[PDB]
Amino acid sequence: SVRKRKMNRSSVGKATRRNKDKQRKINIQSNPIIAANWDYSLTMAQNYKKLGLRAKLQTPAGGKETEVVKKLEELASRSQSEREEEWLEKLYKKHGDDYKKMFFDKKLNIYQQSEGDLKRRLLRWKKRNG
Amino acid sequence: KKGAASNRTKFVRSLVREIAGLSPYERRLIDLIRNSGEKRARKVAKKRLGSFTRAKAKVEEMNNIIAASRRH
Amino acid sequence: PILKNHFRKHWQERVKVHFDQAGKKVSRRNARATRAAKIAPRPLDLLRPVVRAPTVKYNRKVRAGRGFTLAEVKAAGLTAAYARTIGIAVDHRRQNRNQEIFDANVQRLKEYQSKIIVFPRN
Amino acid sequence: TWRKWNVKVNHNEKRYATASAIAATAVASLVLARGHRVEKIPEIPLVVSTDL
RNA sequence: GUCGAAUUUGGGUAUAGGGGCGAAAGACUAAAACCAUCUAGUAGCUGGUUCCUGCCGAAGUUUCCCUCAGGAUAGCAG
RNA sequence: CACGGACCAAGGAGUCUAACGUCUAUGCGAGUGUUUGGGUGUAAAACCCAUACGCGUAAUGAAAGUGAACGUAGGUUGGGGCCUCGCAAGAGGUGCACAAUCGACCGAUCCUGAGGAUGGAUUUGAGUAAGAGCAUAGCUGUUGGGACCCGAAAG
RNA sequence: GUUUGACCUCAAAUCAGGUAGGAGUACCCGCUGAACUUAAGCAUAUCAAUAAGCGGAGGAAAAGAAACCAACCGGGAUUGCCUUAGUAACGGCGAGUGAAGCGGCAAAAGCUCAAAUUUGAAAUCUGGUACCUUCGGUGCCCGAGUUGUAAUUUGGAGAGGGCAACUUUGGGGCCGUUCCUUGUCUAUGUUCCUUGGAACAGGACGUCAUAGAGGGUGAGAAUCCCGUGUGGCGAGGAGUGCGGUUCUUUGUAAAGUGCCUUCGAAGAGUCGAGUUGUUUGGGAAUGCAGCUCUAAGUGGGUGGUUCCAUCUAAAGCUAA
């Protein structure tokens, strides 16, 4: 070649990268339970059937509870603002439970909200209080 | 739901139709309906436009220009 | 007696010989191994539907489809937007017309939903 | 480069040869004809325990 | 009529110049150098074509598709 | 005649491939072909394989269409072998492959009139008539590629 | 008011800040485009939608989420490989050219604008400028902008309300792991006799071997050296993939599910038609380009024996 001829002749030095052994054996990353139980001497599909998990949901072309219990173990195992709370304080102290009157009030229910919104928000207020 | 009616676009097309006036051939076409009739009107429209189905919709469109302008 | 030889053009410029058949099989298996190393607990492919092939010739055969439908996913008891997060391929342009295909897919979805273990966001 | 390098062989023909090859490992005279210093051994086919 | 003919050339610096037809404008359809590629351009031809022994071993021709070319197809040796 | 040949060394010309075909070898055989791929691998090797696909197992007709057993798959003529008798020669039975001739069925082709019926006669075919192919390898032939090696009046 | 002031358009400035060219070019996207040749001499044709020429990109490019294919018991973005298959179709029906759907497989992923008022509030953005925890954030100011920047909405519809005492929740650190670059450690004879200039040879005796690949060393050296094989210990970065720990979360804030209730637009010198030219396997007139003419919305396109099926053009992005 033209450029390669000079680069193999120059005293600059080649940017040699030996990244061939890293192409075959890539470490499993996304799950530490799988990361501890993965036999690197076995292949991908062999390490799936060893653990139990299905590797391909479509039936493959060609010819083909030890750990899943640990997964099952770790898988079987919204507050209100100061102003919103004080707003619901005002509504309860002036009305109580008359949601028709409570939502037809122009002074406290400035946002013309329904009855269902009011009873839900007040019960959130009542659960967090006495 | 091929060409869903759309009350607004029918209004808009007809709103622009009355404002913009008529193209010089359509201006001849509406004179040609009153004098010579739909026979020669469709003949000129077919030569002017692409196909016969074009000339159907166009002469009828112009007949509705006349039907609204004269009566109502 | 017939024979037709398409060697009238400058054919000798475009001759592709696939010496990399053995190299490219290794390359795809390394790709699968990498993808399964990044997508650790999950299979390697989305859950695909059962589908009847078109044409008088192949309408005997049952094959893999692209995705289910909004109809088959709803009848299974979940939403299309949520199905994709669980790895169920969804086809918006496909239509449901055959009852046997429909029910086979719904049961394929239902058995899938029994066998899975969805991880919490915490 | 577009010379033929690889040779297609029939699969049962390939398995014929591999079976015949196994068949000839326990002959003891073909083993001497092939090479293999096998005079001072008890019997062929030679079999050792699984602990190997 | 007769680049008559360049004599006289240093430096600088331009414009042109190939064909029938046609009044012209224009169009029909032909056919000055060097370098690199297309390019291993086309062969109805010239020249050449690389070890040994054994055994068998021709024809140099009819008829047919006419033919110059382009050759095609019964006999002799297998 | 003419053309080449002063002498020596080294180089120097039927090669590779695609397509189709004959013959032979091999594996399997009404089937056959793993190697597009997938799995696996001691890692371009080897070893496994799902689904399809290719060619073949059915042809005929322009297409629509229809679709190969009346018989022990048929009679007659020959026919390697084998069988019974023959002290042997010879006679008879059975007759494989294959060859000739008279028939049965498929296909399109007309009368019969039951609409197209039962039966009547040929023509077509690289037909059915109890399959023979698929794949790999070798010698090789034809055609296309720079195509046995060097050379041409060039656009 | 014979003045002053809004705009609009067009300029300039060594203004502030940016950006374009050239190289390389195998592949990739375009434009432009032959001939030798091959066909019986030969305007079609062929080589060939090739070479040369010109422009334009990246690690890939291009393509791409149907104005797709089909005719089924229907499939479902693209791209690629096997198959279709030298098939359909084209062609002095000559030399020759020559697909695609289906089936298998590789790989797979989806989305975003314009068009319907935020109108109880341009909610948007660039620059300048002062700080800060700086691929940015915050404050103030000049502007862009209503001839429309934001949020909502894209047909798979979608939106405004009401009903579930329906379900959910963001952002930044730090330290681990992932990756990249880089450093280092990790077995056994130089024991005897002969030949030799030299032992790395022959012979004798032994070792290590998850290391007897390779090279060097005064001739063929696992065991002399570097290495190899197997694991161990570090350093500097990239980063959000996840594992911990930790600091923040808020506002009548942002969603999703099912039902009820009220509404509800979809890309024009474009499709098309004619036409000359190019081009394709595309006879059905296959694509495209120029020129004439130029549409419609129970629209329109594309197929299939009275109709039926299937798409949504003339806007845009997107890995493998």
mmCIF file with all atom_site columns, all heavy atoms in Angstrom, chain G residues 20 34 41 75 78 104 116 152 200 239 256 268 291 298 309:
data_model
loop_
_atom_site.group_PDB
_atom_site.id
_atom_site.type_symbol
_atom_site.label_atom_id
_atom_site.label_alt_id
_atom_site.label_comp_id
_atom_site.label_asym_id
_atom_site.label_entity_id
_atom_site.label_seq_id
_atom_site.pdbx_PDB_ins_code
_atom_site.Cartn_x
_atom_site.Cartn_y
_atom_site.Cartn_z
_atom_site.occupancy
_atom_site.B_iso_or_equiv
_atom_site.pdbx_formal_charge
_atom_site.auth_seq_id
_atom_site.auth_comp_id
_atom_site.auth_asym_id
_atom_site.auth_atom_id
_atom_site.pdbx_PDB_model_num
ATOM 1   P P     . A G 1 20  ? -18.255 23.747  9.357   1.00 0.00 ? 20  A G P     1
ATOM 2   O OP1   . A G 1 20  ? -18.456 22.276  9.460   1.00 0.00 ? 20  A G OP1   1
ATOM 3   O OP2   . A G 1 20  ? -16.972 24.342  9.810   1.00 0.00 ? 20  A G OP2   1
ATOM 4   O "O5'" . A G 1 20  ? -18.492 24.212  7.852   1.00 0.00 ? 20  A G "O5'" 1
ATOM 5   C "C5'" . A G 1 20  ? -19.555 23.652  7.055   1.00 0.00 ? 20  A G "C5'" 1
ATOM 6   C "C4'" . A G 1 20  ? -19.515 24.216  5.654   1.00 0.00 ? 20  A G "C4'" 1
ATOM 7   O "O4'" . A G 1 20  ? -19.781 25.641  5.704   1.00 0.00 ? 20  A G "O4'" 1
ATOM 8   C "C3'" . A G 1 20  ? -18.180 24.087  4.924   1.00 0.00 ? 20  A G "C3'" 1
ATOM 9   O "O3'" . A G 1 20  ? -18.115 22.823  4.263   1.00 0.00 ? 20  A G "O3'" 1
ATOM 10  C "C2'" . A G 1 20  ? -18.229 25.251  3.935   1.00 0.00 ? 20  A G "C2'" 1
ATOM 11  O "O2'" . A G 1 20  ? -18.847 24.935  2.704   1.00 0.00 ? 20  A G "O2'" 1
ATOM 12  C "C1'" . A G 1 20  ? -19.011 26.309  4.720   1.00 0.00 ? 20  A G "C1'" 1
ATOM 13  P P     . A G 1 34  ? -24.316 8.852   -23.977 1.00 0.00 ? 34  A G P     1
ATOM 14  O OP1   . A G 1 34  ? -23.952 9.080   -25.402 1.00 0.00 ? 34  A G OP1   1
ATOM 15  O OP2   . A G 1 34  ? -25.718 9.105   -23.546 1.00 0.00 ? 34  A G OP2   1
ATOM 16  O "O5'" . A G 1 34  ? -23.958 7.374   -23.494 1.00 0.00 ? 34  A G "O5'" 1
ATOM 17  C "C5'" . A G 1 34  ? -23.353 6.389   -24.357 1.00 0.00 ? 34  A G "C5'" 1
ATOM 18  C "C4'" . A G 1 34  ? -21.969 6.820   -24.783 1.00 0.00 ? 34  A G "C4'" 1
ATOM 19  O "O4'" . A G 1 34  ? -21.119 6.994   -23.621 1.00 0.00 ? 34  A G "O4'" 1
ATOM 20  C "C3'" . A G 1 34  ? -21.224 5.825   -25.661 1.00 0.00 ? 34  A G "C3'" 1
ATOM 21  O "O3'" . A G 1 34  ? -21.626 5.989   -27.011 1.00 0.00 ? 34  A G "O3'" 1
ATOM 22  C "C2'" . A G 1 34  ? -19.770 6.201   -25.406 1.00 0.00 ? 34  A G "C2'" 1
ATOM 23  O "O2'" . A G 1 34  ? -19.268 7.287   -26.160 1.00 0.00 ? 34  A G "O2'" 1
ATOM 24  C "C1'" . A G 1 34  ? -19.806 6.547   -23.918 1.00 0.00 ? 34  A G "C1'" 1
ATOM 25  P P     . G G 1 41  ? -22.772 -8.743  -38.877 1.00 0.00 ? 41  G G P     1
ATOM 26  O OP1   . G G 1 41  ? -22.081 -9.580  -37.860 1.00 0.00 ? 41  G G OP1   1
ATOM 27  O OP2   . G G 1 41  ? -22.935 -7.293  -38.615 1.00 0.00 ? 41  G G OP2   1
ATOM 28  O "O5'" . G G 1 41  ? -22.018 -8.896  -40.275 1.00 0.00 ? 41  G G "O5'" 1
ATOM 29  C "C5'" . G G 1 41  ? -21.041 -7.927  -40.715 1.00 0.00 ? 41  G G "C5'" 1
ATOM 30  C "C4'" . G G 1 41  ? -21.576 -7.085  -41.857 1.00 0.00 ? 41  G G "C4'" 1
ATOM 31  O "O4'" . G G 1 41  ? -22.592 -7.817  -42.594 1.00 0.00 ? 41  G G "O4'" 1
ATOM 32  C "C3'" . G G 1 41  ? -22.251 -5.775  -41.475 1.00 0.00 ? 41  G G "C3'" 1
ATOM 33  O "O3'" . G G 1 41  ? -21.297 -4.732  -41.282 1.00 0.00 ? 41  G G "O3'" 1
ATOM 34  C "C2'" . G G 1 41  ? -23.127 -5.499  -42.694 1.00 0.00 ? 41  G G "C2'" 1
ATOM 35  O "O2'" . G G 1 41  ? -22.467 -4.845  -43.762 1.00 0.00 ? 41  G G "O2'" 1
ATOM 36  C "C1'" . G G 1 41  ? -23.560 -6.911  -43.101 1.00 0.00 ? 41  G G "C1'" 1
ATOM 37  P P     . G G 1 75  ? -53.669 -13.743 9.344   1.00 0.00 ? 75  G G P     1
ATOM 38  O OP1   . G G 1 75  ? -53.269 -14.537 10.536  1.00 0.00 ? 75  G G OP1   1
ATOM 39  O OP2   . G G 1 75  ? -54.619 -12.608 9.509   1.00 0.00 ? 75  G G OP2   1
ATOM 40  O "O5'" . G G 1 75  ? -52.379 -13.162 8.611   1.00 0.00 ? 75  G G "O5'" 1
ATOM 41  C "C5'" . G G 1 75  ? -51.076 -13.718 8.858   1.00 0.00 ? 75  G G "C5'" 1
ATOM 42  C "C4'" . G G 1 75  ? -50.095 -13.335 7.777   1.00 0.00 ? 75  G G "C4'" 1
ATOM 43  O "O4'" . G G 1 75  ? -50.799 -12.965 6.564   1.00 0.00 ? 75  G G "O4'" 1
ATOM 44  C "C3'" . G G 1 75  ? -49.220 -12.132 8.088   1.00 0.00 ? 75  G G "C3'" 1
ATOM 45  O "O3'" . G G 1 75  ? -48.080 -12.555 8.829   1.00 0.00 ? 75  G G "O3'" 1
ATOM 46  C "C2'" . G G 1 75  ? -48.820 -11.630 6.698   1.00 0.00 ? 75  G G "C2'" 1
ATOM 47  O "O2'" . G G 1 75  ? -47.661 -12.240 6.166   1.00 0.00 ? 75  G G "O2'" 1
ATOM 48  C "C1'" . G G 1 75  ? -50.043 -12.000 5.852   1.00 0.00 ? 75  G G "C1'" 1
ATOM 49  P P     . U G 1 78  ? -41.779 -4.080  4.156   1.00 0.00 ? 78  U G P     1
ATOM 50  O OP1   . U G 1 78  ? -42.216 -3.958  2.740   1.00 0.00 ? 78  U G OP1   1
ATOM 51  O OP2   . U G 1 78  ? -41.955 -5.380  4.862   1.00 0.00 ? 78  U G OP2   1
ATOM 52  O "O5'" . U G 1 78  ? -40.256 -3.623  4.244   1.00 0.00 ? 78  U G "O5'" 1
ATOM 53  C "C5'" . U G 1 78  ? -39.850 -2.438  3.542   1.00 0.00 ? 78  U G "C5'" 1
ATOM 54  C "C4'" . U G 1 78  ? -38.577 -1.861  4.106   1.00 0.00 ? 78  U G "C4'" 1
ATOM 55  O "O4'" . U G 1 78  ? -38.475 -2.045  5.537   1.00 0.00 ? 78  U G "O4'" 1
ATOM 56  C "C3'" . U G 1 78  ? -37.277 -2.474  3.624   1.00 0.00 ? 78  U G "C3'" 1
ATOM 57  O "O3'" . U G 1 78  ? -36.957 -2.140  2.277   1.00 0.00 ? 78  U G "O3'" 1
ATOM 58  C "C2'" . U G 1 78  ? -36.284 -1.894  4.623   1.00 0.00 ? 78  U G "C2'" 1
ATOM 59  O "O2'" . U G 1 78  ? -35.785 -0.606  4.341   1.00 0.00 ? 78  U G "O2'" 1
ATOM 60  C "C1'" . U G 1 78  ? -37.120 -1.848  5.906   1.00 0.00 ? 78  U G "C1'" 1
ATOM 61  P P     . G G 1 104 ? -42.391 -19.673 7.256   1.00 0.00 ? 104 G G P     1
ATOM 62  O OP1   . G G 1 104 ? -42.959 -20.218 8.514   1.00 0.00 ? 104 G G OP1   1
ATOM 63  O OP2   . G G 1 104 ? -42.444 -18.206 7.006   1.00 0.00 ? 104 G G OP2   1
ATOM 64  O "O5'" . G G 1 104 ? -40.878 -20.155 7.137   1.00 0.00 ? 104 G G "O5'" 1
ATOM 65  C "C5'" . G G 1 104 ? -40.537 -21.539 7.318   1.00 0.00 ? 104 G G "C5'" 1
ATOM 66  C "C4'" . G G 1 104 ? -39.077 -21.757 7.016   1.00 0.00 ? 104 G G "C4'" 1
ATOM 67  O "O4'" . G G 1 104 ? -38.793 -21.326 5.660   1.00 0.00 ? 104 G G "O4'" 1
ATOM 68  C "C3'" . G G 1 104 ? -38.107 -20.952 7.861   1.00 0.00 ? 104 G G "C3'" 1
ATOM 69  O "O3'" . G G 1 104 ? -37.919 -21.509 9.157   1.00 0.00 ? 104 G G "O3'" 1
ATOM 70  C "C2'" . G G 1 104 ? -36.859 -20.954 6.990   1.00 0.00 ? 104 G G "C2'" 1
ATOM 71  O "O2'" . G G 1 104 ? -36.054 -22.112 7.120   1.00 0.00 ? 104 G G "O2'" 1
ATOM 72  C "C1'" . G G 1 104 ? -37.469 -20.826 5.592   1.00 0.00 ? 104 G G "C1'" 1
ATOM 73  P P     . A G 1 116 ? -56.661 24.437  11.661  1.00 0.00 ? 116 A G P     1
ATOM 74  O OP1   . A G 1 116 ? -58.090 24.763  11.418  1.00 0.00 ? 116 A G OP1   1
ATOM 75  O OP2   . A G 1 116 ? -55.684 25.532  11.882  1.00 0.00 ? 116 A G OP2   1
ATOM 76  O "O5'" . A G 1 116 ? -56.567 23.426  12.894  1.00 0.00 ? 116 A G "O5'" 1
ATOM 77  C "C5'" . A G 1 116 ? -56.947 23.819  14.229  1.00 0.00 ? 116 A G "C5'" 1
ATOM 78  C "C4'" . A G 1 116 ? -58.375 23.406  14.501  1.00 0.00 ? 116 A G "C4'" 1
ATOM 79  O "O4'" . A G 1 116 ? -58.494 21.966  14.394  1.00 0.00 ? 116 A G "O4'" 1
ATOM 80  C "C3'" . A G 1 116 ? -58.920 23.733  15.887  1.00 0.00 ? 116 A G "C3'" 1
ATOM 81  O "O3'" . A G 1 116 ? -59.403 25.073  15.853  1.00 0.00 ? 116 A G "O3'" 1
ATOM 82  C "C2'" . A G 1 116 ? -60.048 22.714  16.046  1.00 0.00 ? 116 A G "C2'" 1
ATOM 83  O "O2'" . A G 1 116 ? -61.301 23.120  15.527  1.00 0.00 ? 116 A G "O2'" 1
ATOM 84  C "C1'" . A G 1 116 ? -59.506 21.507  15.272  1.00 0.00 ? 116 A G "C1'" 1
ATOM 85  P P     . U G 1 152 ? -47.158 17.631  25.807  1.00 0.00 ? 152 U G P     1
ATOM 86  O OP1   . U G 1 152 ? -46.917 16.407  26.611  1.00 0.00 ? 152 U G OP1   1
ATOM 87  O OP2   . U G 1 152 ? -46.397 17.833  24.549  1.00 0.00 ? 152 U G OP2   1
ATOM 88  O "O5'" . U G 1 152 ? -48.715 17.722  25.487  1.00 0.00 ? 152 U G "O5'" 1
ATOM 89  C "C5'" . U G 1 152 ? -49.696 17.560  26.532  1.00 0.00 ? 152 U G "C5'" 1
ATOM 90  C "C4'" . U G 1 152 ? -51.097 17.621  25.971  1.00 0.00 ? 152 U G "C4'" 1
ATOM 91  O "O4'" . U G 1 152 ? -51.375 18.932  25.402  1.00 0.00 ? 152 U G "O4'" 1
ATOM 92  C "C3'" . U G 1 152 ? -51.408 16.684  24.818  1.00 0.00 ? 152 U G "C3'" 1
ATOM 93  O "O3'" . U G 1 152 ? -51.512 15.312  25.190  1.00 0.00 ? 152 U G "O3'" 1
ATOM 94  C "C2'" . U G 1 152 ? -52.684 17.307  24.269  1.00 0.00 ? 152 U G "C2'" 1
ATOM 95  O "O2'" . U G 1 152 ? -53.860 16.925  24.957  1.00 0.00 ? 152 U G "O2'" 1
ATOM 96  C "C1'" . U G 1 152 ? -52.356 18.807  24.378  1.00 0.00 ? 152 U G "C1'" 1
ATOM 97  P P     . C G 1 200 ? 22.990  -26.387 25.272  1.00 0.00 ? 200 C G P     1
ATOM 98  O OP1   . C G 1 200 ? 23.234  -24.982 25.688  1.00 0.00 ? 200 C G OP1   1
ATOM 99  O OP2   . C G 1 200 ? 23.110  -27.486 26.270  1.00 0.00 ? 200 C G OP2   1
ATOM 100 O "O5'" . C G 1 200 ? 21.542  -26.443 24.604  1.00 0.00 ? 200 C G "O5'" 1
ATOM 101 C "C5'" . C G 1 200 ? 20.904  -27.701 24.303  1.00 0.00 ? 200 C G "C5'" 1
ATOM 102 C "C4'" . C G 1 200 ? 20.258  -27.660 22.933  1.00 0.00 ? 200 C G "C4'" 1
ATOM 103 O "O4'" . C G 1 200 ? 20.147  -26.287 22.462  1.00 0.00 ? 200 C G "O4'" 1
ATOM 104 C "C3'" . C G 1 200 ? 20.993  -28.424 21.833  1.00 0.00 ? 200 C G "C3'" 1
ATOM 105 O "O3'" . C G 1 200 ? 20.042  -29.033 20.963  1.00 0.00 ? 200 C G "O3'" 1
ATOM 106 C "C2'" . C G 1 200 ? 21.743  -27.315 21.104  1.00 0.00 ? 200 C G "C2'" 1
ATOM 107 O "O2'" . C G 1 200 ? 22.107  -27.635 19.777  1.00 0.00 ? 200 C G "O2'" 1
ATOM 108 C "C1'" . C G 1 200 ? 20.716  -26.187 21.173  1.00 0.00 ? 200 C G "C1'" 1
ATOM 109 P P     . G G 1 239 ? -18.485 10.304  29.659  1.00 0.00 ? 239 G G P     1
ATOM 110 O OP1   . G G 1 239 ? -19.084 11.124  28.575  1.00 0.00 ? 239 G G OP1   1
ATOM 111 O OP2   . G G 1 239 ? -17.959 10.977  30.877  1.00 0.00 ? 239 G G OP2   1
ATOM 112 O "O5'" . G G 1 239 ? -19.545 9.207   30.122  1.00 0.00 ? 239 G G "O5'" 1
ATOM 113 C "C5'" . G G 1 239 ? -20.279 8.421   29.159  1.00 0.00 ? 239 G G "C5'" 1
ATOM 114 C "C4'" . G G 1 239 ? -20.874 7.189   29.805  1.00 0.00 ? 239 G G "C4'" 1
ATOM 115 O "O4'" . G G 1 239 ? -19.827 6.356   30.382  1.00 0.00 ? 239 G G "O4'" 1
ATOM 116 C "C3'" . G G 1 239 ? -21.823 7.431   30.970  1.00 0.00 ? 239 G G "C3'" 1
ATOM 117 O "O3'" . G G 1 239 ? -23.038 8.146   30.684  1.00 0.00 ? 239 G G "O3'" 1
ATOM 118 C "C2'" . G G 1 239 ? -21.804 6.067   31.658  1.00 0.00 ? 239 G G "C2'" 1
ATOM 119 O "O2'" . G G 1 239 ? -22.596 5.050   31.076  1.00 0.00 ? 239 G G "O2'" 1
ATOM 120 C "C1'" . G G 1 239 ? -20.315 5.714   31.556  1.00 0.00 ? 239 G G "C1'" 1
ATOM 121 P P     . G G 1 256 ? -52.158 9.557   29.690  1.00 0.00 ? 256 G G P     1
ATOM 122 O OP1   . G G 1 256 ? -51.802 9.477   28.251  1.00 0.00 ? 256 G G OP1   1
ATOM 123 O OP2   . G G 1 256 ? -53.275 10.443  30.115  1.00 0.00 ? 256 G G OP2   1
ATOM 124 O "O5'" . G G 1 256 ? -52.451 8.091   30.235  1.00 0.00 ? 256 G G "O5'" 1
ATOM 125 C "C5'" . G G 1 256 ? -51.527 7.018   29.978  1.00 0.00 ? 256 G G "C5'" 1
ATOM 126 C "C4'" . G G 1 256 ? -51.804 5.840   30.879  1.00 0.00 ? 256 G G "C4'" 1
ATOM 127 O "O4'" . G G 1 256 ? -51.749 6.252   32.272  1.00 0.00 ? 256 G G "O4'" 1
ATOM 128 C "C3'" . G G 1 256 ? -53.177 5.199   30.756  1.00 0.00 ? 256 G G "C3'" 1
ATOM 129 O "O3'" . G G 1 256 ? -53.330 4.369   29.609  1.00 0.00 ? 256 G G "O3'" 1
ATOM 130 C "C2'" . G G 1 256 ? -53.281 4.448   32.078  1.00 0.00 ? 256 G G "C2'" 1
ATOM 131 O "O2'" . G G 1 256 ? -52.611 3.201   32.110  1.00 0.00 ? 256 G G "O2'" 1
ATOM 132 C "C1'" . G G 1 256 ? -52.631 5.446   33.040  1.00 0.00 ? 256 G G "C1'" 1
ATOM 133 P P     . A G 1 268 ? -51.490 20.422  0.317   1.00 0.00 ? 268 A G P     1
ATOM 134 O OP1   . A G 1 268 ? -51.280 21.542  1.270   1.00 0.00 ? 268 A G OP1   1
ATOM 135 O OP2   . A G 1 268 ? -52.868 19.985  -0.016  1.00 0.00 ? 268 A G OP2   1
ATOM 136 O "O5'" . A G 1 268 ? -50.751 20.785  -1.043  1.00 0.00 ? 268 A G "O5'" 1
ATOM 137 C "C5'" . A G 1 268 ? -50.519 19.774  -2.041  1.00 0.00 ? 268 A G "C5'" 1
ATOM 138 C "C4'" . A G 1 268 ? -50.471 20.380  -3.425  1.00 0.00 ? 268 A G "C4'" 1
ATOM 139 O "O4'" . A G 1 268 ? -51.555 19.845  -4.231  1.00 0.00 ? 268 A G "O4'" 1
ATOM 140 C "C3'" . A G 1 268 ? -50.595 21.900  -3.518  1.00 0.00 ? 268 A G "C3'" 1
ATOM 141 O "O3'" . A G 1 268 ? -49.758 22.274  -4.603  1.00 0.00 ? 268 A G "O3'" 1
ATOM 142 C "C2'" . A G 1 268 ? -52.069 22.099  -3.862  1.00 0.00 ? 268 A G "C2'" 1
ATOM 143 O "O2'" . A G 1 268 ? -52.309 23.320  -4.531  1.00 0.00 ? 268 A G "O2'" 1
ATOM 144 C "C1'" . A G 1 268 ? -52.309 20.906  -4.782  1.00 0.00 ? 268 A G "C1'" 1
ATOM 145 P P     . C G 1 291 ? -41.050 22.186  -17.291 1.00 0.00 ? 291 C G P     1
ATOM 146 O OP1   . C G 1 291 ? -40.615 23.534  -16.846 1.00 0.00 ? 291 C G OP1   1
ATOM 147 O OP2   . C G 1 291 ? -41.705 21.271  -16.317 1.00 0.00 ? 291 C G OP2   1
ATOM 148 O "O5'" . C G 1 291 ? -42.030 22.360  -18.533 1.00 0.00 ? 291 C G "O5'" 1
ATOM 149 C "C5'" . C G 1 291 ? -41.606 23.052  -19.722 1.00 0.00 ? 291 C G "C5'" 1
ATOM 150 C "C4'" . C G 1 291 ? -42.423 22.603  -20.907 1.00 0.00 ? 291 C G "C4'" 1
ATOM 151 O "O4'" . C G 1 291 ? -42.336 21.155  -21.053 1.00 0.00 ? 291 C G "O4'" 1
ATOM 152 C "C3'" . C G 1 291 ? -43.920 22.844  -20.812 1.00 0.00 ? 291 C G "C3'" 1
ATOM 153 O "O3'" . C G 1 291 ? -44.338 24.199  -20.936 1.00 0.00 ? 291 C G "O3'" 1
ATOM 154 C "C2'" . C G 1 291 ? -44.442 21.874  -21.863 1.00 0.00 ? 291 C G "C2'" 1
ATOM 155 O "O2'" . C G 1 291 ? -44.335 22.334  -23.195 1.00 0.00 ? 291 C G "O2'" 1
ATOM 156 C "C1'" . C G 1 291 ? -43.549 20.656  -21.607 1.00 0.00 ? 291 C G "C1'" 1
ATOM 157 P P     . U G 1 298 ? -68.043 13.604  1.074   1.00 0.00 ? 298 U G P     1
ATOM 158 O OP1   . U G 1 298 ? -68.860 13.914  -0.128  1.00 0.00 ? 298 U G OP1   1
ATOM 159 O OP2   . U G 1 298 ? -68.299 14.329  2.345   1.00 0.00 ? 298 U G OP2   1
ATOM 160 O "O5'" . U G 1 298 ? -68.159 12.040  1.355   1.00 0.00 ? 298 U G "O5'" 1
ATOM 161 C "C5'" . U G 1 298 ? -67.556 11.070  0.475   1.00 0.00 ? 298 U G "C5'" 1
ATOM 162 C "C4'" . U G 1 298 ? -67.911 9.663   0.911   1.00 0.00 ? 298 U G "C4'" 1
ATOM 163 O "O4'" . U G 1 298 ? -68.520 9.719   2.227   1.00 0.00 ? 298 U G "O4'" 1
ATOM 164 C "C3'" . U G 1 298 ? -68.891 8.937   -0.005  1.00 0.00 ? 298 U G "C3'" 1
ATOM 165 O "O3'" . U G 1 298 ? -68.222 8.028   -0.881  1.00 0.00 ? 298 U G "O3'" 1
ATOM 166 C "C2'" . U G 1 298 ? -69.779 8.152   0.961   1.00 0.00 ? 298 U G "C2'" 1
ATOM 167 O "O2'" . U G 1 298 ? -69.313 6.851   1.261   1.00 0.00 ? 298 U G "O2'" 1
ATOM 168 C "C1'" . U G 1 298 ? -69.750 9.026   2.218   1.00 0.00 ? 298 U G "C1'" 1
ATOM 169 P P     . A G 1 309 ? -65.580 -5.920  1.112   1.00 0.00 ? 309 A G P     1
ATOM 170 O OP1   . A G 1 309 ? -66.035 -6.480  2.412   1.00 0.00 ? 309 A G OP1   1
ATOM 171 O OP2   . A G 1 309 ? -65.871 -4.496  0.791   1.00 0.00 ? 309 A G OP2   1
ATOM 172 O "O5'" . A G 1 309 ? -64.008 -6.152  0.980   1.00 0.00 ? 309 A G "O5'" 1
ATOM 173 C "C5'" . A G 1 309 ? -63.422 -7.449  1.218   1.00 0.00 ? 309 A G "C5'" 1
ATOM 174 C "C4'" . A G 1 309 ? -61.993 -7.489  0.732   1.00 0.00 ? 309 A G "C4'" 1
ATOM 175 O "O4'" . A G 1 309 ? -61.935 -7.148  -0.676  1.00 0.00 ? 309 A G "O4'" 1
ATOM 176 C "C3'" . A G 1 309 ? -61.039 -6.500  1.395   1.00 0.00 ? 309 A G "C3'" 1
ATOM 177 O "O3'" . A G 1 309 ? -60.557 -7.050  2.615   1.00 0.00 ? 309 A G "O3'" 1
ATOM 178 C "C2'" . A G 1 309 ? -59.935 -6.361  0.353   1.00 0.00 ? 309 A G "C2'" 1
ATOM 179 O "O2'" . A G 1 309 ? -58.967 -7.389  0.418   1.00 0.00 ? 309 A G "O2'" 1
ATOM 180 C "C1'" . A G 1 309 ? -60.719 -6.472  -0.954  1.00 0.00 ? 309 A G "C1'" 1
#
